[PDB]
Structures are given as C-alpha cells and as structure tokens.
Design a protein around this nucleic acid. Sequence first.
RNA 1: ACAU
DNA 2: CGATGT
Length: 135
Amino acid sequence: EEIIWESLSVDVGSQGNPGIVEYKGVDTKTGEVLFEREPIPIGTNNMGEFLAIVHGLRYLKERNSRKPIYSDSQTAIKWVKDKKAKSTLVRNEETALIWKLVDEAEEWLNTHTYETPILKWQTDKWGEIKADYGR
RNA sequence: ACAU
DNA sequence: CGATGT
Ligand SMILES: [K+]
Ligand SMILES: [Mg+2]
Ligand SMILES: [Mg+2]
C-alpha cells in the first residue's frame, strides 16, 4: 500500500546475464548511495540481487539499524528467507568469484541473526526501485 | 503466469 | 530478441 520511506533499497546491475555483476544500496528517502560492490566479472542477475540483500543485512546490523530492506527480486527475497541461493549458474573457474561470494553470504546467514524485514518493492505501483541502475 |  | 528464477 504505502512505501516505507525509512528503509534501504538495493538493486543489481549487469552487463549481460550471465555477465558482469555489480550492486548497490541507497537510502530510499534521498537516494544517497550507502554501499556499492566492485563489479564481479561473471555472475547472474539473481546472484547479484541476493548478494545485495545480504550485504544490506550486514550493513544495517553493523550500524544497529532496524530499517527494512526493499528489493524488487521475488527470487532473491526467497533465497534469503531460505538461506540458500538456488542458482543454476555453472560452478567453474570463471564463475569461482561470484560463487565464493554467494557461498560466503549463505555462511554469514547461517551464523548470524537479524530481524530486518525484507520487503518487496512494488515496481508496478511505485516505479523503479531507488537503487536501480537505469539500464 | 509472476518477479527480474 | 536473449537469460535468470519461483
Ligand atoms: K537498470
Ligand atoms: Mg532488481
Ligand atoms: Mg534495476
């Protein structure tokens, strides 16, 4: 119904899918960029969406913030809920970096607690998520 | 179908 | 048009 403006919004950007993957988190209210991941040479959209949420959880926990996180990714929200990224991406030498980050993100979820609500950004009603890359 |  | 996902 209503946007929760006191929140963190995250999104992935890519060049190809699979392809180069980056992600960022922004203050939903102001669009201030709060974190940005250095581009990862090969990954999928959904792996990047997943990493962005987990990074947001870690960012907010470190700062003792109870803000929710918005993502537009039905897939990544479910993977975080399950603590399991069910990616189809081949595990080989060229995908080793993204898979290391995904494995490490799952490991973090399995060793830490959080109450952060992870909310679906309703693109159809509200337009593009504030963390979008514009492409 | 829906979400990217 | 193609790909990633539930
Ligand atoms: K974009
Ligand atoms: Mg997105
Ligand atoms: Mg986007």
